[PDB]
Specification:
part of a larger assembly, 4 chains, 239 residues, mainly beta, seven-stranded antiparallel sheet, five-stranded antiparallel sheet, 13% helix, elongated, Gasdermin-D, N-terminal (chains A, B, C, D), lipid binding protein, Pore-forming protein, Gasdermin-D, N-terminal
Chain lengths: 239, 239, 239, 239
């Protein structure tokens, strides 16, 4: 996919530290911003993980007096680089288990590269409490929520983002080579050959300011809005 | 087809992230724009997917005061590049299973290329809310809908577009080489030959600003208009 | 036909996307313009498909006050190029099944080329709506319709055209080389020869502004005119 | 992980001197600042140690008169450097325990490097006691604590931090080489080969002002705030 590899590497460069739910969609990378809303259904049994659905909706219009007040203050610059290559092959000279004198082989080769820079933007809980206490919910707003209420899915907000700030790119390659030479005096053939190789590569480029991972903070809607920073499981937003 | 290849590759470079129903009609890529209606019939049983039919009609004229109000604000820059080539072949020297001394072979060769740059445009659901509450439906507008009402097919709006803005082009080639030398003392012939090889290539250039994929938002028409950004299945637009 | 090949290729470059009824008659390419009428008889049983017959007639005369109002606004630029090469042959040295010593052969060679640019001109459904609203039918106008009424064939309008304006040319060739050397001591002959080879070439150039395909929109004439952008089968225009 | 190695080495350069609970999350490194709050749940039985999770909250706002008074006065500069390289290989010529003549081998090679400068910032107990004296707790502040009260987890403060001032870098590599030559006349094969080698690299640059380790000082919330500079195990902050 040329994207899950690098984002998985970036998250693994933290030794599974912090939640930082990684992103998969090129279209949803841009939609994951601070104060954004996401919608997730309850899990099926234990392991059918309900994947996160990004909703391009902020909290400013949900509240009445048109907030439009981002409070991003965190910022740092981690530079990262790596590479990779390999070569796997094999050969067999088989004559006993049949009527053949098989002379075949194979070879697999590939590579990779990556280099980026990284911020980390957050939102302070004090900003959340100021926003909640000063300003309230526009309760006659369900044209985006009434159907969402019928679904009843818990709605979360984005409290953490990790984005890249440079002309970042990734380059991959691939080489798959097959071979075969069969000299089999039998019933259907006497001599035959089979081989085929294909090369392949690509190049993907990410623009500056693209979210790579995020963290959520569940909220509850029974009569009014309230954000639970570290809630428990089976915390139903609606009734 | 020289068009489904690259479009399928582009969708696959999302690792199946986001719906982004890909387009197949190269002429209909131009008709897929934000605020444009599409028509889809109900599915047949489970897998006979009703393919989306483009309609070159917007919602501005459906509403009375000649809206003509686009709210496009999204934009990022993904640059893509890749390549591919392959070559399979074979050879057979068959003499036992028949009356022939066959000397034949084959060879298939092909290649490809692609280079592209991509923006993406969106529509804010707050804009949907404002648009819905500011104006009502011009109910005496059905000479496009009474036939649609007779069909009763569910209609959608275009909320996402992923278009390419550059002289993007592809160059494909293809070889098919066959050969044969038959020395077959039998009943109808004694010696014969058969072979044929053909080359093939093409080149298609997509102009700047052509939609590649889209996401829809179902609406309901029973007495007045209302759009459901994410409704449930078997939600009939009409009665 | 030196024209069906390239138009079939152009339609195939859409992967059967959209109806886009292709044209076959070189003279009928100029007659397929927007707002033009076409006449099609009902199908025989299932597969005797009634081929569309172009009529060099517009709708501005059918309405009384001489509208002459085209609403062409669609336009893009698809550049397409391709080529083709092919060559097969054969050889048979036949001696057993008879009294002959036959040494013959054959060879077929051909090529093709095409380079063109593609536009597309369509019409908005709202234009159809207003065109029907303000302005009506001349009921004393049947010199072109009374015989059409007697035939009763369903009449369509041209709602979409794919026309090209560049100096496109097609350059084909063809070689067929037959050979044979017969040494057959029998009853009528003892030794003989027979062979014949002919080349071939052509070059057709289509001028600017030539329609390649089109789409229809059936209407109904029982008492007054009304256009159905997407009706059902067996919708008889007349009574 | 390219991050645990260096922090573990830095802590081991103290011979287990000082607590300095090491940091594992790169996102949490910037969040570990003096006067910051962390949350730890009780341990399970003895060894399921609850990993410390940072909370991006200071103590200036929990007390009413907007403290914003850091008392950092500690400072020193330790310069540290190291390196490493290795090479582990092997070879086996095995013929007795089977039907094979096995000639295989392996090779592992890797390296590392690091150069770093280190401060240490602290806070005086006298500051804690005086700050407790002048100003008290906002008792109507549990919208960030009442759910934390429901968790019941003991809350700490950050009293010691160790950070770096350079663009410190790490350069790990890795080589894994596999080989094999199998001459095994048996039941399924007569001769075979198998090998595969892959290199690897990475380079992470940690910017200036990144926390490496920290120490905590538990506080108690039963009716008012009070910090114990060194409490005992199973001291419940809440009731």
């Amino acid at each position: 996919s040329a994207f899950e590899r690098v984002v998985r590497r970036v998250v693994q460069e933290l030794d599974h530290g912090g939640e930082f739910i990684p992103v998969t969609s090129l279209q949803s990378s841009t939609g994951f911003q601070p104060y954004c809303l996401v919608v997730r259904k309850p899990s099926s049994s234990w392991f059918w993980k309900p994947r996160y659905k990004c909703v391009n909706l902020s909290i400013k219009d949900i509240l009445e007096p048109d907030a439009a007040e981002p409070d991003v203050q965190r910022g740092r610059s981690f530079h990262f680089y790596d590479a990779m290559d390999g070569q796997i092959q094999g050969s067999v000279e088989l004559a006993a288990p049949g009527q053949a004198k098989i002379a075949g082989g194979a070879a697999v080769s590939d590579s990779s590269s990556t280099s980026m820079n990284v911020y980390s933007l957050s939102v302070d809980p004090n900003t959340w409490q100021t926003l909640l206490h000063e300003r309230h919910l526009r309760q006659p707003e369900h044209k985006v929520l009434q159907q969402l209420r019928s679904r009843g899915d818990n709605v979360y907000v984005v409290t953490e983002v990790l984005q890249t700030q440079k002309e970042v790119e990734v380059t991959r390659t691939h080489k798959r080579e097959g071979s075969g030479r069969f000299s089999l005096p039998g019933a259907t053939c006497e001599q035959g050959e089979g081989q085929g190789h294909l090369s392949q590569k690509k190049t993907v480029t990410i623009p500056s300011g693209s979210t790579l991972a995020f963290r959520v903070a569940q909220l509850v809607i029974d009569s009014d809005l309230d954000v639970l920073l570290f809630p428990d499981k089976k915390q139903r937003t609606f009734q």
